[PDB]
Amino acid sequence: WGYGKHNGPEHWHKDFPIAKGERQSPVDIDTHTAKYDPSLKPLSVSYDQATSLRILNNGHAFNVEFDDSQDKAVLKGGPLDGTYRLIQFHFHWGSLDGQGSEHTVDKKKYAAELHLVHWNTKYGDFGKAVQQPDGLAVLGIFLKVGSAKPGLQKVVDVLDSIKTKGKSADFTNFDPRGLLPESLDYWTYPGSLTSPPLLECVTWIVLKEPISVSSEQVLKFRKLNFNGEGEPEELMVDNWRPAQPLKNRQIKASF
Numbered sequence: 024w025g026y027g028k029h030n031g032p033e034h035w036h037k038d039f040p041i042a043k044g045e046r047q048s049p050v051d052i053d054t055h056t057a058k059y060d061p062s063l064k065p066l067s068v069s070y071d072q073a074t075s076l077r078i079l080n081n082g083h084a085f086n087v088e089f090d091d092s093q094d095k096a097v098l099k100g101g102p103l104d105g106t107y108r109l110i111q112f113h114f115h116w117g118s119l120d121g122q123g124s125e126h127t128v129d130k131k132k133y134a135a136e137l138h139l140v141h142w143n144t145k146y147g148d149f150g151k152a153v154q155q156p157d158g159l160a161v162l163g164i165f166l167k168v169g170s171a172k173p174g175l176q177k178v179v180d181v182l183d184s185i186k187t188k189g190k191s192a193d194f195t196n197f198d199p200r201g202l203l204p205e206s207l208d209y210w211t212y213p214g215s216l217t218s219p220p221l222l223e224c225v226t227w228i229v230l231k232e233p234i235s236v237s238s239e240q241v242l243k244f245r246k247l248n249f250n251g252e253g254e255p256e257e258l259m260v261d262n263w264r265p266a267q268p269l270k271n272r273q274i275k276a277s278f
């Protein structure tokens with residue numbers, strides 16, 4: 024699987040039948056049909072103690088991994104029950120500024136989308152979490168092209184070193200707090216991972232307010248390669264999946 028014409032999203036169903044499931048992600052967020060739920064609590068992001076470890080190019084994207092052996096960086100509150108530990112963050116981006124995000128707002132697409140993945144720590148490890156309907160929580164953040172995002176530059180600068188598939192680099196002392204918008208208002212719905220295995224284990228929490236990044240910052244994302252070293256060069260662009268059918272699910276809003 025990849026994002027090209029021969030192994031693209033439209034083909035994932037063949038190897039991952041769940042591709043056509045009942046709670047697939049991403050979806051279109053219709054702001055007028057979204058339900059304000061007053062019973063929804065404020066999100067609690069505790070990332071002061073986050074321990075970034077490394078950055079790796081896995082052939083589909085670049086992942087920043089965190090030490091999740093203790094409740095170091097956690098997410099709680101909102102629509103969630105119990106604690107969820109940050110394990111990794113990654114982005115989805117387009118070849119042009121008019122596309123890149125997974126989720127859309129009133130059919131509007133952003134230049135990129137940041138996903139902060141967390142797993143429910145009553146399941147003990149990530150692998151068990153993926154076997155539960157409430158095993159995972161992803162914080163989704165939209166990226167729009169405008170002014171540079173200072174807290175994003177350390178990531179941009181190490182990309183050169185993980186240009187092709189399978190490369191990794193030490194990446195410690197990176198604070199994820201530097202990627203958050205001012206406002207924590209969000210939308211939430213039950214979905215799934217947006218790339219195979221597409222497991223339907225996720226509680227989505229898509230933030231209303233996008234963060235802005237510079238054109239030059241998004242340009243370096245686009246210098247990455249899907250391919251391994253010594254292979255014909257295929258630029259890592261458009262690694263996003265098209266919106267899926269809501270199918271009776273209800274999207275709730277905290278505002």
Ligand SMILES: [Hg+2]
Pocket residue numbers: 152153154155156157158222223224225
């Ligand atoms: Hg699941």
Ligand SMILES: [Zn+2]
Pocket residue numbers: 113114115138217
């Ligand atoms: Zn993702």
